[PDB]
From Swiss-Prot, chain A:
Domain notes: Contains two catalytic domains, a glycosyl hydrolase domain in the N-terminus and a cysteine, histidine-dependent amidohydrolases/peptidases (CHAP) domain associated with the amidase activity in the C-terminus.
Function field: Component of the endolysin PlyC that degrades the host peptidoglycans and participates with the holin protein in the sequential events which lead to the programmed host cell lysis releasing the mature viral particles. Once the holin has permeabilized the host cell membrane, the endolysin can reach the periplasm and breaking down the peptidoglycan layer. When associated with the small subunit PlyCB, the large subunit PlyCA displays 2 catalytic activities, amidase and glycosyl hydrolase. Cleaves the amide bond between N-acetyl muramic acid and L-alanine in the host peptidoglycan.
Note: Part of plyC operon, which contains plyCA, lil and plyCB genes.
Enzyme Commission number(s) of this protein: 3.2.1.-, 3.5.1.28
Region of interest: Glycosidase activity: 1-195
Classification via PROSITE patterns: CHAP (PS50911)
Annotated Peptidase C51 domain residues: 276-430
The protein, known as: Endolysin PlyC, large catalytic subunit
Catalytic machinery residues: C299, H386
Gene that encodes it: orf11
Keywords, sorted A to Z: Antimicrobial, Cytolysis, Host cell lysis by virus, Hydrolase, Viral release from host cell
Organism expressing this protein natively: Streptococcus phage C1
UniProt catalytic activity: Hydrolyzes the link between N-acetylmuramoyl residues and L-amino acid residues in certain cell-wall glycopeptides
Region annotation (Disordered) ranges: 194-214
From Swiss-Prot, chain E:
Miscellaneous comment as given in the Swiss-Prot or TrEMBL entry: Part of plyC operon, which contains plyCA, lil and plyCB genes.
Subunit comment: Homooctamer. Part of the PlyC holoenzyme, which is composed of 1 PLYCA and 8 PLYCB assembled into a ring structure.
Coiled coil: none
Protein name, entry field: Endolysin PlyC, small cell-wall binding subunit
Its biological purpose: Component of the endolysin PlyC that degrades the host peptidoglycans and participates with the holin protein in the sequential events which lead to the programmed host cell lysis releasing the mature viral particles. Once the holin has permeabilized the host cell membrane, the endolysin can reach the periplasm and breaking down the peptidoglycan layer. The small subunit PlyCB is responsible for the specific binding of the endolysin to the host cell-wall, probably to the rhamnose of group A streptococcal carbohydrates.
Gene3D superfamilies (UniProt xref): 3.30.720.190
């Protein structure tokens, strides 16, 4: 559907967020209860209504995200926290991660939608990519446009959608922008813009070769087997021995266990089990490789080449070098700790889930560092994070050696210690 | 996903070889032929999709009956 | 008896193609037609919603009986 | 050593049902194949902890009765 | 962590009370309605069966369904 | 986080004791049959397969009717 | 959020091993509602891998027999 | 009582005399002709090794 | 809160039993309440992947037969 004009959609997306439309206090909170909508977010992670929302709203204000636009988007879909993504203790904590995600999206550039899963590319009526780039910084469009696929397809490729539709191979979806504007008015998002913004990054990262995927279930079994094998001290117990030796007769048959779904389960298992002489010789040989392309020309290759020189095994097939036993993911640089298995040689650990933390003490030169899916602050990552090696650090700044930064090669780059550690998801020390 | 709540016991079967019978399925001990790809994609979410050669189909029928 | 907590075994089925029968469901071996979108959204929380083409509906009826 | 129970052992099979539309029948439920009417919000909040609360329109209620019995 | 055993207590039911007139703590154990006299039995049973809230007005309706 | 396993013991029931002034010692329900425990060794042994819960002397009479 | 791991048994044996540490009837076991006496330590160690080994005093054995029958 | 509605296993021998790939599907013994069916069924049921001499004994237990 | 279920699809309930003492009966097994004798090591290694392999002394074999019947 397309209930509004092209100028109106553009004006709605041009709105900075920022802009709360002057409905910041009680009126937006009272709407959130009735429009439910917000029923799964009200029941799960129990919040004490308008009064507790008056304690939730300043946290959105602290993160510079519109109180009206966040509550409206929470009503749009729910659930499985608050918006999209998988899991995360409390509602206030769960909200902070969602706000931290928007921070790594509203300033980072991502190629516009126009449909990708389940065939047929939408033929445009060039102007969408022109409009997304026309939008400056922290705007509602810069958050929506890369995420909502169904919305862009009905606004910038309306002619194609109406002529088709269409089941599984063709257009099956509706217009989420219509549903968002209809509920937002139920504040004027078009008239407010015309009568914001006028302000000032491009995404980094790619994916490794990966012979994946045939059997995801095989990876899920080992992750659970090793979880109980590492936590054998609690069992050593009759019921405990039955839980430890539970893996013999198969099979854990899961139909909907997708590659994205397996990784979410594998990272959940990882956050539970979690909580120099070898490097020094090759360090002098690695510093001479700075300025040159080692791969492949990707972040995984420089990490793979460095690991193969120290431990013996690599990550990227182009470095080749023998491969590490792939026990998970895999595709993304968040993370390599988290697949690959370094028990074969020497491992660090330091797995940092969702929020936060950083840990300056867990540095150790020269460890392989992993950056979050969407950073954004120093690297401005997208989907698959970033990876490199640590060279030196001070209680103020950190020197790192990394490859694919907006088109490689191996470059020596210094970042703020606090800003860099915020991007971190994991480290692997030798 | 919750597949035990579906009330459907069976699997989807097709061949990637030269001679193809398309997509067929066993649903609660009853053999049925799928005509559209939408039904295949829909059922794949609740029941598994496996590969069975045309020559072996006859043997599976006797076991599933 | 002796399964899950909702006490409902089945699935929701619809077609996104040209020619639609709306939203229909199988609840405890009984085929029912859904009239409102509220009932669809409500049942989606307990039972899965899958896609079945109008042409294949006849075959599913025989297997679910 | 303590032998912890799952619970999971409520001995109740069913769901709570209501409508957010124009004409409302309030909160009603199905407990072990028996249809019941809920009078207070305390019982709704209490049962929501053991059985799921779903939305069923007044028009569709008649069809659900035949399937649940 | 937290290994649970399925079908061991041999008890199927729940504990019920009201926070509003009060009838005290009562429970349904294997389709049989029983009245709890002490808080020790409540705390003990809470470890095996769930404790839910049922208003005095709704108690009559639950009896018919649990029978 | 949590793992669920089967009752490979063939025993369905629980152990019950009082911490109050008047005590009946340790008693248990094994497959719908009420039995009295005499030694602490049997208590510690059964605690590994069946749960040990607290029931007051006054409430014991009501539990008997429900477990029968 | 909170992942659950449901494990199914494969041994087809329901029961337990029982003995005393005081002053003894040796090692005895209840296998599928049938009481049996173990003669060798090899069978004890073998069965301990599939069924639990618990402690029951000689005085209490008589009471357990009535309940397990 | 189980998802996929198939209860059984795939069996073959790596020894000198081979009977190829055979399987037990819901208490019914069936002979597999193509490797496509073997690879397909391996995703739902386990594939174990049974010697030709022992096959006769397994038939009596699975019946 | 998703749930991963590790269920027995093999359709086989039982165990493999053997002795390590002086007098040996070799490898034997109990498949679905039916006692069977294994002749080759290949069948032992194959079945060990689906059913557990435990130790039972020759003297105790007679007692296990009565309980497994």
């Amino acid at each position: 559907s397309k209930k509004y004009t092209q100028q109106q959609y553009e004006k709605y997306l041009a709105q900075p967020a920022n802009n709360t439309f002057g409905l910041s206090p009680q009126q937006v909170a009272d709407w959130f209860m009735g429009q439910a909508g917000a029923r799964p977010v009200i029941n799960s992670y129990g919040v004490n209504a308008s009064n507790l929302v008056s304690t939730y709203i300043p946290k959105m204000q602290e993160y510079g995200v519109s109180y009206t636009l966040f509550l409206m988007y929470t009503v749009f879909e729910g659930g499985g926290n608050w918006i999209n993504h998988y899991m995360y203790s409390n509602g206030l904590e769960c909200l902070e991660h969602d706000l931290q995600y928007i921070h790594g999206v509203w300033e980072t550039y991502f190629p516009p939608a126009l449909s990708a899963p389940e065939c047929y590319p939408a033929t445009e009526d060039g102007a969408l990519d022109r409009f997304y780039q026309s939008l400056p910084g922290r705007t509602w469009g810069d958050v929506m446009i890369p995420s909502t696929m169904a919305g862009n397809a009905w606004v910038w490729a309306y002619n194609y959608c109406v002529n088709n539709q269409g089941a599984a191979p063709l257009v099956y979806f509706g217009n989420p922008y219509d549903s968002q504007i209809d509920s937002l008015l139920a504040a004027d998002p078009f008239t407010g813009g015309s009568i914001g913004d006028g302000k000032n990054s491009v995404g980094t990262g790619n994916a490794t070769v990966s012979a994946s995927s045939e059997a995801n279930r095989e990876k899920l079994k080992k992750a659970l087997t090793d979880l109980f094998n590492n936590n054998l001290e609690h069992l050593s117990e009759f019921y405990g021995n039955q839980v430890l030796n539970a893996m013999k007769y198969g099979t854990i048959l899961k139909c909907d266990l997708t590659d994205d779904g397996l990784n979410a389960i594998l990272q959940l298992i990882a956050d539970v089990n979690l909580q120099s002489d070898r490097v020094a010789a090759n360090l002098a040989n690695a510093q001479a490789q700075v300025g040159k392309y080692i791969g492949d020309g990707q972040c995984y290759a420089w990490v793979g080449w460095w690991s193969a020189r120290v431990c013996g095994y690599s990550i990227s097939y182009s470095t080749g070098d023998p491969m590490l036993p792939l026990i998970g993911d895999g595709m993304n640089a968040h993370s390599i700790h988290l697949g690959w298995d370094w028990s074969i040689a020497n491992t660090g650990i330091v797995n940092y889930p969702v929020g936060t933390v950083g840990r300056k003490e867990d540095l150790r030169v020269g460890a392989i560092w992993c950056a979050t899916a969407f950073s954004g602050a120093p690297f401005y990552t997208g989907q698959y994070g970033h990876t490199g090696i640590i060279e030196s650090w001070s209680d103020t700044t950190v020197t790192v050696l990394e490859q694919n930064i907006l088109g490689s090669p191996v470059i020596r780059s210094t970042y703020d210690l606090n800003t860099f550690l915020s991007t971190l998801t994991g480290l692997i020390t030798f | 996903n919750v597949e035990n709540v579906s009330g459907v016991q069976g699997f989807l079967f097709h061949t990637d070889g030269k001679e193809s019978y398309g997509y067929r399925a066993f649903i609660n001990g009853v053999e049925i032929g799928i005509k559209d790809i939408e039904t295949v994609q829909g059922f794949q979410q609740i029941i598994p999709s496996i590969n069975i050669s045309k020559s072996d189909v006859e043997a599976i029928r006797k076991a599933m009956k």
